[PDB]
Amino acid sequence: TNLCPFGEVFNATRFASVYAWNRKRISNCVADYSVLYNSASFSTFKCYGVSPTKLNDLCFTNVYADSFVIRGDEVRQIAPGQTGKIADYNYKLPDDFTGCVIAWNSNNLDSKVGGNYNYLYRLFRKSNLKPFERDISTEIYQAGSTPCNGVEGFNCYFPLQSYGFQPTNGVGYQPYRVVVLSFELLHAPATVCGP
Amino acid sequence: QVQLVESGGGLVQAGGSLRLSCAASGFPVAYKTMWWYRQAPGKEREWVAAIESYGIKWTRYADSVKGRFTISRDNAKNTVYLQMNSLKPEDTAVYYCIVWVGAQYHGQGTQVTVSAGRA
């Protein structure tokens, strides 16, 4: 075994948009979760169904790291049984979720003067996302009874919008880098453990 | 085949009033987020106001302009308005409106100069 690539997902230069969140599969390595939980550089480190303290004592078959960027007021939606445009149309956590949600402020990294327009989000959808689903289509949403014919107009709108993170925004509109850890137990040798 | 040009700038005095208009073309400004930025000669480009694509509270303003500015969304004319009231000679600059629909779309800008004194 060797070290787990935690610095690759937590310290990446550019994170993914919430509508197109990335996933990093971590296997065949020893992981030290205590240094992540006790670093104080994370304003939110909330685990569901597992203790963050004694998280090192457990072994799992696979660990998934989902990373993206939302705004300040939307971090509370990265929780099980939560609702909102992020949880409904962008990233849904299951009701029986087992893992940890990690979110820290990244205004000094993800906001430009005049606005950083790289981070997007979904605004409309015909039906809510199932847990861990991921929508990518840029199809013009039909909000009315008239079809759209692939053209934006009345009741037909482009379903994606940008956050436009600029530094002097209020905290509720500043960028927040979010990492969601999922632990998997399978009929297979537990490949990731603690020190 | 998509653009937006702003108008309504010009000269005004003291606690005057001005109506900017970000006339959008080629797309419906209904569930879009418009930003208002301003640029005074030499200094940094400052964010002024913003109206969001969704939200219970869809209006956003900076601390320097809060209470005096109001950003509206005319759907019949397919344009976005910015109501600047009780002006001050400290907030005169070039005003821009930016939107994102697939890519960043810029306005050319408009000149707003408010004055003070006697004449």
Residue numbers in the entry:
A (entry chain A): 333 to 527
B (entry chain B): 1 to 119
Describing publication, verbatim:
The virus exploits its trimeric spike (S) glycoprotein to adsorb to the host cell-surface receptor, angiotensin-converting enzyme 2 (ACE2), resulting in proteolytic processing and conformational changes required for membrane fusion and cell entry. Here, we take advantage of available sequences of five SARS-CoV-2 RBD–directed sybodies: Sb14, Sb15, Sb16, Sb45, and Sb68 (previously designated Sb#14, Sb#15, Sb#16, Sb#45, and Sb#68, respectively). These sybodies effectively inhibit the ACE2–RBD interaction and neutralize viral infectivity, and a bispecific construct, consisting of Sb15 linked to Sb68, blocked ACE2 binding and neutralized both pseudotyped and infectious SARS-CoV-2 viruses. Each of the sybodies represents an immunoglobulin variable-type fold consisting of two β-sheets packed as a β-barrel linked by a disulfide bond.
Sb16 angulates over the RBD by 83°. In addition, several non-CDR residues (Y37, E44, and W47 for Sb16), derived from framework 2 (27), provide additional contacts to the RBD. Sb16 and Sb45 directly impinge on the ACE2 binding site, offering a structural rationale for their viral neutralization capacity. Sb16 and Sb45 capture more surface area than ACE2 or other published nanobody or sybody–RBD complexes. Remarkably, CDR2 of Sb16 shows Y54 in starkly different positions in the unliganded structure as compared with the complex: the Cα carbon is displaced by 6.0 Å, while the Oη oxygen of Y54 is 15.2 Å distant, indicative of dynamic flexibility. Sb16, largely unaffected in binding to K417N, showed decreased recognition of N501Y and failed to interact detectably with E484K. Other cryo-EM studies indicate modest effects of the N501Y substitution on binding to different antibodies. In contrast to the effects of N501Y, E484K revealed major incompatibilities because of charge repulsion in the interaction with Sb16 via K32 and Sb45 via R33. Our new structures increase the understanding of the details of sybody interactions with the RBD, and in the case of Sb16, emphasize the dynamic role played by CDRs in adjusting to epitopic surfaces.
